[PDB]
């Protein structure tokens, strides 16, 4: 009694001096103390200093048990000399962050703890020795534990560290603000809040993010794990693993004692709880001992929900430390690997080296304490069960385990249901992308209904797919709802039937709840863990295998010496591309003066780019030696061009001199292409920029190294895709005698003929040995082979868009089918915590059976009431799903074909790809992952209102703070995963290139200069992923701050009311509640999802309402049927326009023509005789006057009415993938005797039938499998198909050979000989022979008359005819 006051005494210091003393820390303002060996190795005593602590209060703890009770001051004491401990190992960590050498009040203070010890010390060791023996071992080998400690650090406390030398300011721009921030600013993580509330208000960008603090930039984790590597590399077992072992593995200490010391915080509060369930029961404890057990039940749950915000913020951050150094020495590789390796592989499959890989060294950074801490907190949870529920918990903890193999049969059996369901999108996609390419030509048949109906069949298929893949969620909402009621089922039903005297009272039943809670969580993520340790040491074999490559720089060539003249000077050496192929060059004897231009020439093969590769190193050399002096300017065959602007390929990497620049632009025959170009020269230029043409892209590298300005030009023919005159006008101005390059050495490697004669001095290879080195006509006179080889939210509105699609009486049957469970779930543990109130002093409480049953059969209601809603929930998803790409279909085909012009096909695709998957296979289960969160949520916060009501009058504030956190945290995370998605991609299209042109990167000797490029691109990146790792703890701080307020209010309040609760609905209202921050955690997280997840859905309703003309059939206004051939098509003031809103493309047009007359239309480009075409099929509306066929005014009938009684050859030739039956008639209403019979007329009878397939011929990707002539024939063959009495042909002689036109004109002349023929050209050739020719001008007709009359008109086809 009198050693326990007296421990109080240090630790009621510390926390009066710390308010008076962190103020006084708001006065060095930069004293940063390095991280000695005094400071590290100061602030561990702390943490055995706490771990002391807890085993001696655990040991109080086992008091309950046994029935022996110590002190009630007396279990209190360890609690609070093991949170001064956490503050002083707090201290210590934030002392030396601030300059304070000597601390002053930490030196005092254990000075108080040693003497305050000593009372203690000296009232039990003249009892020791001298009284007998142990006397209570525990707490006398404790007790020397946190003496021996308090000595070491009383001793290591009065020294004085090195002097700070802080820092100058060193950064203007907003920086990383947890340097400089308070102590209670940086425990809460409310430095982040100021860009919360910011990124509420405003859009966050790349220019608002935080500055990296140094230790954490791109260059400065690469640079420490390389020297690892290397001081590994030395040992002479070359292994990685180590390596980043050694270099992060101190970083990862750090995170292991705060994930210790708050496992073992989290078992404090179950204990906590028997102790206030236990206070309950007895009616003569002070209530005091209940206000203290409520207020430590808070402040031991704030400090395990606290110090665990502060394992994920290290745990995250080393986490991006381990993908920043890896993809750096992966990329500080590819720089030096040997030829040979990058051509043993792909391009694209070393890219996916920190892609794919190197990047899931970020995910298991999480899960690589759940190796020691998920079995340390199943073993310990186990043997807190155990003394509580006895050997009851085999089941409770058998039931959830098996719970992992029947939890992941259900994750590979959604798969086999999640690619049958990719490859039938991809199908569909298929076809849409199909459709989308050609619209007009399938508008213009009236295919409209075939093709339609075609996507909804193979929609049909994927919704049915869908049938059976959402009904593997109804068995994830179990395992997440009914699984913790059927632990505490089948643990009870075993523990009262293993022995008839096991009474089931307030504390075994819910502190055993308490702790099947904790234990549930590290348990089931041990699946993760197991997944990731699997599929994350795959990555690192193929890391460590890339990394133990060849590197080929063995100086190869000597850039010091040269016998003074020669700029290259080759001594009989032999190269091969790798030693286990037969070398390539033989005994190569070279001597290439300065300023020499040498062509090397030979036979095609002969080993022309072997020299030049030789020459700059790329060859393993297997004998010689090779002696080049001076800066080597090289041109690749195939050219290589940064993803970037044409200024800085051919800048690449040198000031900007623009008078020097215009001359090397000029030269290079450059000048010319920066007109044509869409930005001039600052276009992209690859794959984000324009495909140049290939001989823009070898002028844009020749360009390149002339302005590099080096001192030798190897070339390996980099003019061989260029034009003759521009060839030659580059060889003049720039590498022939004239041009710039005069001055410098030069190397010509060439397949040409025509640059020999103006060469300075030539060498012929033959088979890999040099032949002959001469001039050109000394050479020549020898007749050597030289001669023979002459941004916002979503409103309600979507949410009840979504649910009018869902059915809402549909979304009823779920929102008041929860109610059910919910209720279900609160009648059940009612039920259990009147179980627990037996008749505390009668015989015939023997009604164990009832009791047991009306739980089991109101949780299995429980069961049967979720698996009921969340297969009417996964029915209305799949309902939404198909009403929605139903509207989105129905709406998009019947749009004006004005849209498709406007929109281009890319837009509309991804409508069909992205935004109705979204709507497909992820709401579904994010509504119901929602709604299985709030209604844990809500259950678990009326259970508690019902037990003690004052409660409700809290809960009024803490749903305010806890939907501003929300809508704080919401606003903001979203932006930074957008601004993260956005820069993760230039990393990739980076290390894209450096690996293609590595050549060309060393070539220039700029191979750091692209190490820091790609240092400042994985660091735009890493400035937005270390937020977004702290909007994820400031926001568990402001939700693990409400879901432990509630564990405060409903032990206060149940304290408070301590004359009315009884041991079971305090039990139930405490225990039920501290998993209310697990149901607030899930509850925000998909809260979040939902929210953005669901634009997508008002997206697909968006584009559902654009404006369209859908009258296809008017069934009430038929024209006549039997259509004759009367072929009086006339116009009548027509008047049309392609966009609503411009000017009027043909003005007041007016024509009559009778039937089977030939009338031609011909005219300028841009007259607007395209359109024509167009407004006779009503794709562009009426507008002004109005068009009759037959006297019939069109504009009244239904649109597949009018265009399915005329016939075309539209200009495109479009021919949809599949059989050619249906490239024939969609519509199937043709016999099969009469479509032979029209490959006969078609002329393409030959082809058809001499394939073995015929009538289901394979159709590729539209028309490349068939030639041009073949497509137009298959046009026309559609055409004698329809056979109307209206033909009107679309200049179809544009782009092919005479032959087929040959024959598409002597078809249309016999076949269609009695109909109506509108044909338009460009060619009059055509209808020379037609009688009767309308020519259009400016919109307006000006002649329309017989071939001969208008050429006796002298008019303008007159003048047209003179043309041709």
Not at 336 to 352: L, M
Not at 853 to 863: D, E, H, N, P, S
Not at 1109 to 1135: D, H, K, M
Request: charged share 15%.
């Amino acid at each position: 009694f009198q050693n326990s006051l007296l421990a109080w005494v240090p630790c009621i210091y510390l926390w009066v001096a710390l308010p008076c003393y962190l103020l006084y820390l708001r006065h060095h303002c930069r004293g940063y103390i390095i991280l000695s060996h005094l400071s590290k190795l100061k602030m561990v005593l702390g943490v055995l200093l706490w771990c002391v602590s807890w085993a001696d209060l655990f040991y109080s703890f086992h008091g309950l048990v046994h029935g022996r009770a110590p002190a009630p001051v007396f279990f209190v004491t360890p609690l609070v000399v093991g949170v001064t401990m956490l503050l002083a190992t707090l201290l210590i960590q934030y002392e030396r962050l601030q300059g304070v050498q000597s601390s002053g009040v930490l030196i005092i203070f254990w000075f108080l703890c040693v003497v305050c010890a000593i009372v203690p010390f000296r009232s039990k060791i003249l009892l020791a020795k001298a009284e007998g023996e142990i006397s209570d071992p525990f707490r006398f080998t404790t007790f020397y534990i946190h003496f021996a400690l308090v000595l070491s650090a009383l001793i290591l406390a009065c020294f004085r560290e090195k002097p700070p030398f802080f820092s100058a300011k060193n950064v203007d721009p907003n920086p990383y603000p947890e340097t400089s921030a308070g102590f209670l600013s940086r425990l809460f993580f409310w430095w982040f809040t100021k860009m919360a509330i910011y990124g509420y208000r405003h859009p966050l960008e790349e220019k608002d993010l935080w500055s990296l603090k140094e230790e954490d930039r791109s260059q400065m984790v690469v640079q420490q794990l390389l020297e690892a590597w290397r001081k590994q590399e030395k040992q002479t077992k070359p292994s990685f693993l180590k390596a980043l072992l050694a270099t992060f593995g101190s970083s990862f200490l750090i995170s292991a004692c705060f994930k210790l010391i708050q496992d073992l915080l989290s078992f404090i509060n179950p204990q906590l709880l028997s102790i206030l369930i236990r206070f309950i029961s007895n009616p003569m404890a002070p209530s005091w001992w209940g206000f203290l057990v409520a207020g430590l039940m808070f402040l031991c749950s704030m400090m395990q929900s606290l110090i665990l915000q502060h394992y994920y913020h290290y745990i995250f951050v080393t986490g991006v430390k381990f993908r920043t150094g890896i993809m750096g020495v992966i990329y500080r590789k590819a720089l030096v690997i040997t030829n040979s390796v990058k051509r043993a592989s792909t391009v694209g499959e070393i890219v996916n080296l920190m892609s794919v890989d190197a990047q899931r060294f970020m995910d298991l950074a999480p899960f690589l304490n759940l190796l020691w801490s998920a079995p340390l907190q199943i073993i310990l949870a186990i043997y807190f069960l155990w003394q509580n529920l006895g050997p009851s918990v085999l089941a409770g903890v058998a039931f959830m385990v098996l719970l992992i193999p029947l939890n992941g049969a259900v994750a590979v059996k959604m798969r086999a249901f999640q690619v049958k369901q990719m490859k039938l999108k991809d199908s569909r996609i298929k076809l849409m992308s199909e459709i989308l390419n050609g619209i007009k030509v399938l508008k213009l048949y009236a295919w409209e209904p075939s093709f339609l109906k075609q996507v909804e069949g193979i929609r049909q298929g994927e919704l049915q797919l869908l049938r059976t893949a959402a009904y593997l969620h109804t068995t994830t909402t179990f395992t997440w709802m009914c699984s913790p009621f059927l632990v505490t089922l089948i643990t009870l039903w075993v523990y009262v039937y293993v022995d008839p005297n096991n009474v089931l009272d307030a504390e075994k039943a819910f502190v055993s709840v308490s702790l099947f809670n904790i234990l549930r969580l590290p348990l089931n993520m041990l699946p993760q863990l197991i997944s990731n340790l699997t599929q994350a040491s795959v990555s690192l074999k193929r890391i460590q295998q890339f990394l133990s490559q060849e590197e080929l720089d063995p100086q190869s060539v000597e850039r010091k010496t040269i016998s003074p003249g020669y700029a290259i000077t080759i001594h009989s050496g032999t190269f091969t591309w790798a030693q286990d192929l037969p070398p390539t060059l033989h005994s190569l004897d070279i001597q290439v003066p300065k300023g020499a231009l040498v062509a090397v020439v030979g036979p095609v093969g002969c080993g022309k780019s072997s020299l030049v590769s030789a020459l700059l190193g790329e060859m393993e050399k297997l004998e010689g030696k090779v002696h080049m002096k001076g800066s080597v300017a090289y041109v690749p065959q195939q050219a290589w061009i940064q993803n970037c602007t044409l200024q800085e390929n051919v800048l690449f990497g040198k000031a900007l001199n623009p008078k020097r620049y215009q001359q090397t632009l000029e030269a290079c025959a450059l000048l010319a292409d920066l007109e044509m170009l869409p930005g001039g020269d600052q276009t992209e230029i690859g794959e984000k920029g324009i495909n140049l043409s290939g001989g823009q892209r070898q002028r844009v590298s020749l360009a390149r190294a002339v302005y590099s300005d080096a001192d030798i030009f190897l070339l390996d023919d980099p003019l061989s895709a260029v034009d003759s005159h521009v060839a030659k006008h580059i060889f003049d101005h720039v590498i022939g005698p004239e041009g710039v390059l005069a001055g410098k050495t030069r190397v010509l490697v060439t397949h040409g003929i025509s640059f020999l004669p103006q060469t300075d001095f030539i060498i012929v290879l033959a088979d890999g040995q040099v032949s002959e080195m001469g001039p050109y006509p000394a050479l020549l006179q020898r007749n050597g082979s030289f001669a023979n080889f002459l941004i916002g939210t979503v409103e309600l509105s979507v949410f009840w868009d979504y649910a009018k699609a869902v059915g809402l009486c549909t979304t009823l049957a779920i929102c008041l089918l929860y109610v059910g469970q919910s209720a279900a779930a609160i009648g059940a543990n009612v039920w259990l915590s009147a179980w627990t109130n037996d008749a505390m002093a009668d015989s015939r409480q023997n009604n164990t059976s009832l009791r047991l049953g009306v739980y089991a059969a109101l949780g299995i209601l429980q069961g049967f009431l979720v698996m009921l809603a969340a297969m009417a929930m996964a029915a209305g998803g799949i309902q939404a799903a198909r009403v929605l790409h139903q509207a989105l279909l129905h709406n998009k085909i019947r749009s004006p074909q004005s849209f498709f012009d406007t929109t281009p096909s890319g837009r509309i695709l991804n409508c069909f790809s992205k935004d109705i998957y979204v709507v497909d296979e992820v709401l579904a289960p994010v509504i119901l992952m929602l709604l299985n969160s709030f209604f844990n949520a809500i259950s678990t916060l009326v259970v508690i209102m019902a037990s003690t009501p004052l409660f409700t009058v809290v809960i009024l504030p803490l749903a305010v703070l806890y939907t501003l956190v929300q809508r704080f945290y919401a606003a903001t995370s979203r932006q930074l995963k957008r601004l993260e998605s956005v820069s993760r991609s230039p990393i990739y299209s980076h290390f894209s290139e450096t690996v293609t042109g590595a050549s060309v990167i060393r070539a220039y000797n700029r191979s750091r200069d692209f190490e820091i490029i790609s240092d400042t691109k994985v660091d735009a990146n890493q400035r937005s992923c270390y937020p977004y790792i702290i909007s994820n703890r400031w926001l568990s701080i402001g939700v693990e701050f409400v879901g432990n307020c509630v564990v405060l209010f409903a032990a206060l309040f149940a304290v408070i009311g301590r004359s009315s609760l009884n041991p079971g609905l305090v039990g139930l209202s405490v225990s039920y509640s501290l998993q209310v921050t697990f149901a607030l955690n899930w509850m925000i997280r998909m809260m979040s999802d939902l929210e953005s997840n669901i634009v997508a859905v008002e997206r697909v309703k968006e584009y559902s309402k654009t404006e369209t003309e859908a009258p296809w059939v008017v069934e009430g206004s038929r024209p006549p049927e039997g259509w004759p051939p009367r072929g009086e098509v006339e116009f009548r003031n027509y008047s049309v326009r392609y966009r609503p809103g411009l000017d009027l493309v043909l003005r007041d047009l007016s024509l009559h023509v009778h039937g089977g007359e030939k009338v031609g239309i011909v005219g300028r480009t841009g007259a607007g005789k395209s359109s024509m075409t167009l407004c006779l099929f009503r794709i562009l509306e009426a507008a002004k006057g109005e068009i009759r066929i037959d006297g019939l005014n069109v504009a009244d009938i239904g649109l597949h009415d009018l265009r399915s009684q005329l016939t075309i050859i539209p200009q495109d030739p479009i021919l949809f993938s599949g059989t050619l039956r249906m490239n024939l008639d969609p519509f199937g209403s043709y016999s099969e005797e009469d479509i032979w019979w029209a490959l006969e007329l078609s002329h393409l009878h030959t082809f058809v039938s001499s394939q073995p397939a015929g009538l289901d011929f394979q159709c590729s990707e539209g028309g490349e499998n068939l030639s041009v002539g073949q497509r137009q024939l298959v046009c026309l063959a559609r055409a004698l198909l329809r056979k109307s009495r209206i033909l009107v042909l679309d200049e179809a002689t544009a782009a092919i050979d005479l032959e087929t036109d040959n024959l598409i004109q002597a078809t249309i002349r016999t076949q269609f000989d009695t109909c109506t023929v509108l044909t338009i050209a460009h060619r009059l050739n055509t209808i020379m022979d037609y009688t009767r020719v309308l020519v259009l001008d400016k919109g307006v007709v000006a002649e329309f008359d017989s071939p001969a009359n208008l050429i006796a008109a002298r008019g303008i086809f007159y003048g047209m005819a003179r043309d041709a």
